Design a protein around this ligand. Structure first.
Ligand SMILES: NC(=O)c1ccc[n+]([C@@H]2O[C@H](COP(=O)([O-])OP(=O)(O)OC[C@H]3O[C@@H](n4cnc5c(N)ncnc54)[C@H](O)[C@@H]3O)[C@@H](O)[C@H]2O)c1
Ligand SMILES: NC(=O)c1ccc[n+]([C@@H]2O[C@H](COP(=O)([O-])OP(=O)(O)OC[C@H]3O[C@@H](n4cnc5c(N)ncnc54)[C@H](O)[C@@H]3O)[C@@H](O)[C@H]2O)c1
Ligand SMILES: NC(=O)c1ccc[n+]([C@@H]2O[C@H](COP(=O)([O-])OP(=O)(O)OC[C@H]3O[C@@H](n4cnc5c(N)ncnc54)[C@H](O)[C@@H]3O)[C@@H](O)[C@H]2O)c1
Ligand SMILES: NC(=O)c1ccc[n+]([C@@H]2O[C@H](COP(=O)([O-])OP(=O)(O)OC[C@H]3O[C@@H](n4cnc5c(N)ncnc54)[C@H](O)[C@@H]3O)[C@@H](O)[C@H]2O)c1
Ligand SMILES: [Mg+2]
Lengths: 341, 341, 341, 341
């Protein structure tokens, strides 16, 4: 019965903890610690009150022992006691004391294989970097696709990105059935926590601009990450992302060149079958006239909007929605649950 | 000189009149009447104050004369005296007595050949439908591409849409140089007037949804319209539009298969060259990391963002911005100006 | 028990029906009919999918029995079967046939005593106008304040407005304990369905302006409505509303002159004591550092934010939140429930 | 001429530089240096492209002479050569060499007398802190009210806040005419650069919350600041600020108890006369139904909205708009100009 810790109690970290309590299936592992540079009182406040996902439907108590700070959290007839830490430098964390089996690295600041190793030094056995790899990882994993390819010897793992976890299924499903010559991705994405309120100095001159006022083209880490999960598609895939002023939920627009005959009907039927069989854990398809809000708090890795499917000659476009926060958080727990032996 | 009337004093109609006063170049025609179902005081207020384009830099006085209502408008060293009408039925408009050469039909309600002809019945010599054709038109015109083909028998002209005026040049330039087998268009567009503030009954169930809260995929009239200007593109292009919570400015994302070798470098050089020569009146290209608000109040039909160009194999993506209100308005003025030398 | 109909399935009508299913209290009456000008498929879609309140957690099945349309709705262990009408004129509705005890009039168009009685002609026994009075009503009711005052002969009742149901308790509690010489109200309010997406002709020149871009001061009906509930406050109170770009939830800021000694502590203690006793059904008090989204889907008529209370000399300001949709809907259900024997 | 430096090239600093170029009448002093922690290319990009105020109508060329970085800026028939620094510690800046007469302190981080004096150590003869006094200042100045009270020996000056520069004139004008017993302010203010895009750890739990999604009550420095400027009003005035999802422009809502007879007419007439006589430089009054975006890029410290004025008994509300960025930036330049140039 494994022991998970979360480093970085932000949009992803907090949602991982909520999704644990809200899941209709109880997970076999326990989350037993969290860390963030903010104090516990700020953390509990933000865990309880969320502008995107609403009030946490449960009870949180804070316990100060002589040394340690704990949360006692109850919801949906489940209970966790969760040590809270406030240590900026992940090597100085007490992962050995706490017997931590997996650390979920959700800060965005420790994606290098070196930085992820800091958690290995502090005592943890295994790290899931919750982002695209910066350089080296023992594996890059998309739950529902290649999670069985985790070797019990692998110690630094990447759960890639929200975008990746939606792209890879699409690419795999379509490449297996029709063959993909090349494809280009357009992602339309809600604002993210690293953007700016008003125009302000920032590393990226596009993300420096007022996030509430602009359509903002930007890079996606998803293409680099898809190469690692499917090296057979090197040089065959590119794309980018566009930030717009919604609070949550994203869509992927994938345009590809088929290597065999295609119709709108054949593509949709294939995606329906995939969703009903081999991918039913992470994938759904709808034909209802829905918009982004309707997928807020959806646990799926992608939801294909089949009415958007288009074909001209050898070229086609498919479209899928996903909750970039709730889908990924759920896939993190699904991944941790897959290590059970 | 020519005598222009404007039917429907909305986003487009008001921006047409504003752009006449703001144009660096005076036009060789006059706007002599406007018609709306709204009261003159409402129209003058909205003409003077605009949430998108700022205050009209000028003065407006209402006078009554012979029981007719006029606006006297002074700005940028020009004055217009403009009759104001309030007739919901085009056939009952006094175009014959006003000696109207051109009606700009900007209501959205009279796009059919028969409906547009009502202005002809009322005595105007020529209508421009400020929208895509519904059924039939004498001619579908994109200024700077095929405005020279207008013949004196073309009485009902469609100036198509914002999107078509950006898409048609892109397709043409690229098809002429490299050849397009097929292409798919994704437009990312600011909210439009016909959308909803909150979820509300509406003919279209996606545009029924709260416009400030959602990413909303919907149809685009632009592909139908492009096919009327370039019939050879039938069955070779398709696309769709996405509404997002910004007030103004749109982007087109065009994905195509080239029929000859492409690189990013070569595509960009072609588009730059086009912008300097044959399409200098309507088209610019930038290489700066810009966002939508940077194009607000730009008069160009399109501004290629050369930093977004991508190529994999035979497949490319190009990206261009436009102010969907100010570009189109200026193109309506340009079209009228071309009607007599 | 008792049989209710809803005329107008908009933000209010739809949320009344949702709130029926969601209420922890089960109500001893049934909604047996809805009427809108829109078709049933649009209505069901909007009932199921909401940008503000999320997906309805339940199922709807549309059946045709006779030539009558019905919704079979199941949620929260509860079930209703509701006839669906599409009649634009209330006198033509089948209320006598259906044996309607109470019509909830939620269109906004039949607020006058004459228009409302059309339901009574059509066969309904009692109408509740879900809006401030236009001219005369038999009674103007704030649930939890003066609902005991409904006479069995009262046939045309007004449940006033969301703003009125926050304001009246506040004014009453404070005037009763300390005395209010005069007071002024500033409401800060989310956008409402009658506002504009872009600058558009509108009867109100302020509400003509782009609702996602602007702070928009406008009128509030709550002052007239309050004066019908409390005629003593004629000439002693005024105020206005400011619309800002949020989707739901509002706040009242009430500045009053006290007729007797006041402190922050004493005002807060009073409001707390009222919330715990005579007003526990409709009122809460918090001292947590919360924001508007934290009150979305709150059923309270008002939640006082005690940290905002200020006193200078004889002048004070109190501040209360409310979900302007969900509070009002629940108060409508509470009012209907109060009519039982 | 007099020689000014800007410390902190953000929303205020950048607008100060733009306002220099845009002012119809040329200022007779020059801005010769800017310092920020961000790289010069980021600074020049943000200076040229602004989501709120549009593109700079000018050209900027970056030059390296010696080991010094210079901005050569040309706009509106005016030229400046501006050294760019990147020194986080103000004691280390080369103000002695540059013979700086006045440093505009626009970072928000150096508001204490000791912090501001670091600029004096570096050789600057005078500092204007562009914010409320933190501990002590030689003078707290509202331009147009008490800028004449500056002494030649005053070295650390506060120009207070945008809010204070609107509040003080109102309080003063109304107090001088009718007498204010007490007053309470509500400010409705656009989002600021220190807020959050999504729910995020922050020192302040309300400003932690998604700024595009929420109404957020918070504190204002203006009340403390007004006390420094007008000591007689100790114990007579309080208030607070509310952040809402617009990008720029704020309003003051001021409720006061008057010590002599008042009417709406008399209050408005007073404010109009004040604006035409003693306050013409900094104040305007409108009687048209305007909204926030109509004041974007307005240089006034306050524009009174005479249609909002209300009176009940001895109590009154007045309402004023201001562009929080452009007003304050203009007032900084005017205060510098008041020292002679
Ligand atoms: N938000 C999404 O939609 C999404 C989806 C998939 C993956 N991701 C990835 O998740 C990661 C985090 O993103 P987020 O949206 O949760 O951002 P966030 O800013 O909400 O979370 C970052 C958190 O880390 C904390 N923190 C900062 N420095 C720290 C340190 N030294 N030690 C510990 N905690 C520290 C912050 O206080 C904060 O709570 C990134 O790699 C991001 O790319 C995000
Ligand atoms: N705004 C854009 O981005 C854009 C770009 C290109 C084309 N268009 C097209 O322009 C047309 C108008 O769109 P808009 O954005 O100006 O919309 P709008 O709703 O702002 O304009 C419609 C106007 O027509 C008036 N009107 C309605 N019925 C009338 C009647 N019977 N007679 C006279 N006036 C009447 C209304 O009062 C309103 O002023 C549409 O066909 C639209 O597709 C819009
Ligand atoms: N939403 C709020 O915050 C709030 C709170 C209190 C009171 N109110 C009041 O309630 C009323 C309705 O407001 P709303 O927000 O629900 O508006 P809405 O526009 O969302 O709903 C109006 C509904 O009435 C329907 N309708 C129109 N004409 C009809 C007819 N002849 N017969 C039947 N149905 C018809 C429309 O199709 C629509 O579904 C207004 O008077 C409003 O001021 C609103
Ligand atoms: N924006 C408004 O409406 C407004 C109005 C009145 C007063 N103010 C005040 O003006 C100040 C600045 O606010 P702003 O809106 O310009 O914010 P901002 O964040 O846009 O500007 C701050 C700037 O300072 C720079 N900076 C940070 N640390 C620095 C350092 N050590 N040395 C030099 N430069 C450094 C940052 O890179 C940034 O460019 C604050 O005190 C604010 O309250 C703001
Ligand atoms: Mg909106």
């Amino acid at each position: 019965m494994q022991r998970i810790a979360i480093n970085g109690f932000g949009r992803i970290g907090r949602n991982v903890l909520r999704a644990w309590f809200e899941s209709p299936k109880q997970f076999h592992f326990e989350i037993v610690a969290i860390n963030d540079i903010a104090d516990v009182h700020t953390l509990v406040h933000l865990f309880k009150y969320d502008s995107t996902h609403g009030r946490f439907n449960g009870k949180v108590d804070i316990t100060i022992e002589n040394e340690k700070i704990y949360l006692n959290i109850q919801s949906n007839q489940r209970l966790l006691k969760v040590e809270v830490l406030q240590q900026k430098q992940p090597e100085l964390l007490p992962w050995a004391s706490l017997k931590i089996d997996v650390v979920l690295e959700c800060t965005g600041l420790f994606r290098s294989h070196a930085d992820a190793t800091r958690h290995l030094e502090a005592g943890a056995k295994r790290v899931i970097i919750g982002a695209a790899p910066f350089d080296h990882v023992d594996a890059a994993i998309v739950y529902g696709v290649n999670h069985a390819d985790v070797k019990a010897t692998d110690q630094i793992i990447s759960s890639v990105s929200c975008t990746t976890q939606a792209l890879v299924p699409l690419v795999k499903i379509i490449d297996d059935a029709f063959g993909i010559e090349t494809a280009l991705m357009t992602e339309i994405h809600a604002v993210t926590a690293d953007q700016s309120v008003l125009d302000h100095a920032h590393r990226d001159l596009r993300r420096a601009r007022a996030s509430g006022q602009n359509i903002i083209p930007t890079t996606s880490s998803a293409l680099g990450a898809l190469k690692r999960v499917m090296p057979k598609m090197e040089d065959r895939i590119d794309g980018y992302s566009i930030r717009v002023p919604t609070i949550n939920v994203a869509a992927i627009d994938l345009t590809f060149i088929a290597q065999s005959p295609i119709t709108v009907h054949h593509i949709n039927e294939l995606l329906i079958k995939a969703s009903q069989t081999d991918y039913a854990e992470i994938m759904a398809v709808t034909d209802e006239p829905l918009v982004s809000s309707d997928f807020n708090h959806s646990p799926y890795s992608l939801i294909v909007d089949l009415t958007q499917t288009m074909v001209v000659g050898h070229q086609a476009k498919v479209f899928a929605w996903y909750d970039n926060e709730w889908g990924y958080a759920n896939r993190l727990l699904d991944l941790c649950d897959s290590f059970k032996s």
